[PDB]
Amino acid sequence: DDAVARAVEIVRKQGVADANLVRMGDKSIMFSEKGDAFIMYGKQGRSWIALFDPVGPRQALPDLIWRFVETARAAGCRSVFYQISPALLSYCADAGLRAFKLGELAVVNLANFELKGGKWANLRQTASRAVRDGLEFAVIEPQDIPDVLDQLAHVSDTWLADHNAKEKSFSLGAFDPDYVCSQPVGVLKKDGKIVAFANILMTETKEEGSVDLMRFSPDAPKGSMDFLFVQILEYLKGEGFQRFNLGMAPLSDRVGGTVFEHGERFYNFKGLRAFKSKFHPEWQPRYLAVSGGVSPMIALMDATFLIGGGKLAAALEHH
């Protein structure tokens, strides 16, 4: 009785790459009546928190959203939609939810991207140095990931240790073998070993691609992150994709400050905004929507606890 595998079937058929986060298995799933759309969500504090836009055909969305919001209310909890797109603002408002800007998503139009055409000098130069340093890129399909799982784990473990970092959840994936083997990975190799990898989040519609995990061993040279992103970008472009999402960046007032702190905590694991700006991306806003007139502060703190695994040790270091 695997709700997750059923949700994956819906993911494959739509265009939102980040809906693949359902594959982590740590989110509950609520299906539409016809079974053609779903909301994946978590529970934290007195909140039910949906992750991203509801997934599936737009026609299923108003009843599905309403079911989610009413089910949370019946359980004594507020309802939250975490990191929704502009196209969901009207649907969420029609269910009584107010939206607040969370940050912006960096999106690369793959048709126009031309590494050597003149508009991306910094990335072109960095990619040259990467090749000269001996870095090679490959995409590894799921069934071929077990054979390198020891190398991926080496990269992941040393990355976490290097950054004194702990695994997150909900909106961010973690090095869980079932999840890691479920989607293709892009890897960098040097001197015969993998020194970096990212999972490549795709769908069958070839609209949008993204990455979730992205990690580097101490043997990854400087510029490895730039090169891995460019290499995955070109792979997706070559496979016919329209867009490559590089991830969220923090918001460019107690409300706005809490929003900024939340983004600083969670949006800077695979390059800062300045790194994303090297791709001259389109910046698309994303939102937190909350029921009941509650201030976005409460919902965002619940999301912070939820992504941190139910824990929050301290404020971030700031001067």
Author numbering: 542 to 793, 805 to 871
Manuscript text:
As a large family of membrane proteins crucial for bacterial physiology and virulence, the Multiple Peptide Resistance Factors (MprFs) utilize two separate domains to synthesize and translocate aminoacyl phospholipids to the outer leaflets of bacterial membranes. The function of MprFs enables Staphylococcus aureus and other pathogenic bacteria to acquire resistance to daptomycin and cationic antimicrobial peptides. Here we present cryo-electron microscopy structures of MprF homodimer from Rhizobium tropici (RtMprF) at two different states in complex with lysyl-phosphatidylglycerol (LysPG). RtMprF contains a membrane-embedded lipid-flippase domain with two deep cavities opening toward the inner and outer leaflets of the membrane respectively.
The crystal structure of the catalytic domain of RtMprF in the C-terminal region has been solved at 2.0 Å resolution, and serves as the initial model for building the corresponding region in the cryo-EM structures of the full-length RtMprF. The synthase domain of RtMprF (Pro539-Gly860) superposes well with those of PaMprF and BlMprF (root-mean-square deviation of α-carbons at 0.977 and 1.297 Å, respectively). They share similar tandem repeats of the General Control Nonderepressible 5 (a histone acetyltransferase of a transcriptional regulatory complex) related N-acetyltransferase (GNAT) folds (GNAT folds 1 and 2). The potential binding site of lysyl-tRNA in the synthase domain of RtMprF is located at the cleft between GNAT folds 1 and 2, according to the previous studies on an alanyl transferase FemX involved in peptidoglycan biosynthesis (in complex with an aminoacyl-tRNA analog) and BlMprF in complex with L-lysine amide (LYN).
